[PDB]
């Protein structure tokens, strides 16, 4: 009973990101009797061809992108979606999505911007990262004028949020005598850069007659919807300037309920000034939060949406089944992870059926004996599980 | 012969510097003429506060100028109202929001913004949140003593009604110039220039860059802006990508998951990826969206818009005489946008009805008096007065 359809031993990761000097190689391995042949394709289901010095298919089936020149860059190659297909006589199955992105060595700079504060009011200096280079660039550490710096590596005064921003506990004219620059790390080449300018604190002495933020003439409230992976640290921003120091109360909405509740403050969950930090996010943390700002004059609130993503996975049951002619045949897709955008089924590398979690065949015919796959797509990643339908 | 009716009401907002005085007028009418009484937000009568507020002979509250140390919140920041009454009953004027402003130390900034060659840039003037209400952007100033004010769209350099500066089809030639924002304080007229000169740092495109989005994290923002009716709006879709993307603005509608293409015209203008609306109306309050796209990928920046129109209420009939035992009826017409809630009053106290039409099954002796329709929204209020006579 060694005869069986193909199954993926190793699927490449959903994200392959590399540089032009680095080059890259993608491995795809499958089993089953006879050993299936490995083949690379695109979204439309056509086999990818070789390209000189750019895209190679090695003897043992693999996708090789050699290191190339910035001029040799071709989008339809270097920014593309690929999929691995394994097949033998019994049937064929397609891998999950593989997003290949070859970054090049670019020029970018960051700058720390100055922020206005008031005595007694905390604040945050940020690091401007160009939006285009911001995906592969995050701040390694902040710095102080004489150069002794602060990593995640003591008196809580300066807190570094997981967002890579410097927090300052309360404030005082003593604080504005310092300047800071943020250093950043490229997660591809590992190259580092100091920010173009040292950020500074301008501290305003108040008198009276001021309420937090809002607007009287115009403008808006910013609803910031943000997502953080499971097991990752979140951040929720409630920066404001008021008179005198106000109260910050974090709240949360439950699943469409307009009734706002209290946020439990744990050793894992800290309200800091008005800024909330969560460690090790999970699906339950997903929801919209609220920050109530009131001093004696009243106020207005920061609305924030949180969505915790978890890595996608798929399992089909039964993994293999043999049913006679005329009977029903049923497949059940069992998946985990968030968010789940679309669900779909495939047959020998062909789209079939609806988006339903359960694929059913009323009367199984002889032509139905190929491989069946279940695909769960997401805004970011995807995944799938194979299966085999034999006959009797 | 008749009850109180307002001749001249006070306004919704009075904003004034401490260095400037201020006053609010309430004229009333009636037969006999009603007495005028000013009241706090809680309905309590206000007295003379020396040097801060005094009640003038003419039936108007006068706030004289004051030193910042004499500021008192229970006076200088509050909602007042004007109650006028006579034998037959009482009425109350629309809420009057009174905010006195002290001149506060501040400074502005023009910050650099990073872009890709061929993409469009928008430079912002940083205005601290606290004075941001009274401080707005007059013009932008370059290093040449040139300048940019607003206008009545196809040019490279253009100033947005939001007080920002849009630049189209950028190239290295653009980063060769700095910029400073000219601001104006509307209560005083103080003028400044941003202490820092904003420049443009440009990056030569090398290889494919999808629209902004995020792969790791934060930065997807829904801005919900409100602009007065007849005013000019600004709808933003910041993006930086290579090759240069294109921007399609769309419009959601009530209770819909879907949208439709914004129809461009002489009234509705698209500058690069930025959408501008002027001479707008209530119908122009949708929930908008812009979709950025290029040969790589795409992104959507979502924006909610609210156009506000001045609230004005009415009642018909303004007066009716009813023989005891029959029904009274009061219909209330209102306008202005939006409408948050509605309330009713009797001789200066809330009866607690939330609906436009007010009926009374059995009219009695005590039921005779003055009835008022009260409509409001977040920033504004409006009232309508009605009298009831007993036959
Ligand atoms: C992957 O792509 C990157 C980006 O294009 C590429 O790095 C580049 O390599 C080229 C060489 O092929 C560099 O070109 C220059 O060539 C002149 C001579 O023609 C040299 O003088 C240059 O040295 C400069 O170095 C300093 C900057 O670091 C300058 O300030 C100095 O004055 C010299 O001008 C340089 O060698 C090009 O500068 C780099 N650019 C970057 C951003 O790295 C890399 O080689 C590619 N990988 C491959 C092909 O495997
Ligand atoms: C409304 O309130 C505003 C602000 O509260 C107020 O404007 C202020 O006017 C006063 C003067 O009337 C200004 O006070 C000056 O401020 C400096 C500090 O910046 C002080 O050091 C000055 O004192 C000098 O003068 C002395 C001699 O008189 C010297 O011997 C001494 O060494 C100092 O040099 C001076 O008091 C203040 O700066 C402004 N503030 C603003 C924001 O404009 C305004 O007058 C009020 N309106 C009224 C009262 O109608
Ligand atoms: C807080 O401010 C909100 C306005 O944003 C207001 O509705 C609420 O009553 C205030 N609560 C307290 C306790 O100040
Ligand atoms: C535009 O981008 C959206 C996602 O932001 C995508 O769904 C759509 O297909 C794109 N359209 C074009 C023409 O690129």
* Secondary structure: helix percent of chain A: under 10%
CATH topology of the largest domain in chain A: Immunoglobulin-like
Give the CATH architecture of the largest domain in chain A.
Answer: Sandwich
Distance between the termini of chain A: 15 Å
Bound small-molecule species:
a molecule of 4 linked components (NAG-NAG-BMA-MAN), 2-acetamido-2-deoxy-beta-D-glucopyranose
Q: Output the radius of gyration of chain A.
A: 27 Å
Reported for the largest beta sheet of chain A, the result is: 8 strands, mixed
Q: Per the principal axes of the C-alpha atoms, what is the gross shape of chain A?
A: globular
Strand content of chain A: over 45%
Q: How many beta strands in the DSSP annotation of chain A?
A: 37
CATH first level of the largest domain in chain A: Mainly Beta
Protein name (chain B): Cell adhesion molecule Dscam1
Subcellular location (chain B): Cell membrane; Cell projection, Neuron projection; Cell projection, Axon; Perikaryon
Glycosylation sites (chain B): 18, 293
Disulfide bonds (chain B): 26-82, 125-181, 332-373
Describe this structure in words.
Chain A: Residues 6-101, 118-195, 228-307, 311-390 form the Ig-like C2-type domain. Two copies of one chain form a homodimer. By secondary structure, chain A is mainly β. Chain A has one helix at residues 75-78, and strands spanning 7-10, 15-18, 24-27, 29-31, 37-41, 56-57, 62-65, 79-88, 91-94, 98-102, 111-112, 115-118, 123-125, 127-128, 137-141, 158-161, 165-168, 179-180, 183-186, 192-194, 199-204, 220-229, 247-253, 260-262, 269-272, 275-278, 287-295, 298-299, 302-317, 320-323, 329-338, 342-347, 351-352, 358-361, 372-377, 382-385, 388-391. The longest helix of chain A has 4 residues, at 75-78. At the A-B interface, strand 22 of A face strand 10 and strand 21 of B. A molecule of 4 linked components (NAG-NAG-BMA-MAN) binds next to loops of chain A.
């Amino acid at each position: 009973a060694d005869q069986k359809g193909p199954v993926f031993l190793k699927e490449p990761t959903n994200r392959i990101d590399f540089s032009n000097s680095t080059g890259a190689e993608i491995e795809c391995k499958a089993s089953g009797n006879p050993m299936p042949e490995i083949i690379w394709i695109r979204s439309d289901g056509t086999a990818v061809g070789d390209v000189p010095g750019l895209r190679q298919i090695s003897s043992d089936g693999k996708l090789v992108f050699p290191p190339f020149r910035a001029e040799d860059y071709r989008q339809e190659v270097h920014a593309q979606v690929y999929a691995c297909l394994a097949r033998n006589q019994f049937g064929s199955i397609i891998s999950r999505d593989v997003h290949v992105r070859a970054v090049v060595s670019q020029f970018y700079i960051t700058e720390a911007e100055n922020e206005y504060v008031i005595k007694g009011n905390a604040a945050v200096v940020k690091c401007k990262i160009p939006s285009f280079v911001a995906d592969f660039v995050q701040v390694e550490a902040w710095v102080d004028e004489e150069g002794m710096e602060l990593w995640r590596n003591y008196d809580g005064k300066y807190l570094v949020l997981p967002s890579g921003e410097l927090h300052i506990r309360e404030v005082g004219p003593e604080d504005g005598y310092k300047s800071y620059q943020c250093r950043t790390k490229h997660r591809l080449t590992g190259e580092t850069r100091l920010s173009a300018t040292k950020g500074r604190l301008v501290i305003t002495e108040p008198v009276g007659s001021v309420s937090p933020q809002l607007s009287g003439n115009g403008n808006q409230e910013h609803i910031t919807l943000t997502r953080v992976p499971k097991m990752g640290s979140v951040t929720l921003m409630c920066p404001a300037q008021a008179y005198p120091v106000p109260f910050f109360r974090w709240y949360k909405f439950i699943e469409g309920t307009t009734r706002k509740q209290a946020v439990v403050l744990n050793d894992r969950v800290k309200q800091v000034s008005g800024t909330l930090i969560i460690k090790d996010a999970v699906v339950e943390d997903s929801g919209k939060y609220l920050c109530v700002v009131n001093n004696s004059v009243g106020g207005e609130s920061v609305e924030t949406v949180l969505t915790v993503t978890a890595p996608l996975s798929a399992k089909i049951d039964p993994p293999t089944q043999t049913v006679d002619f005329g009977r029903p045949a049923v497949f059940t897709c069992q998946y985990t992870g968030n968010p789940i955008k679309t669900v779909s089924w495939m047959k020998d590398g062909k789209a079939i059926g609806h988006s339903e979690p359960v694929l059913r065949i009323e009367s199984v015919k002889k032509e139905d004996k190929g491989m069946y796959q279940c695909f769960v797509r997401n805004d970011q990643e995807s995944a799938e599980a194979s299966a085999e339908l034999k006959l009797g």
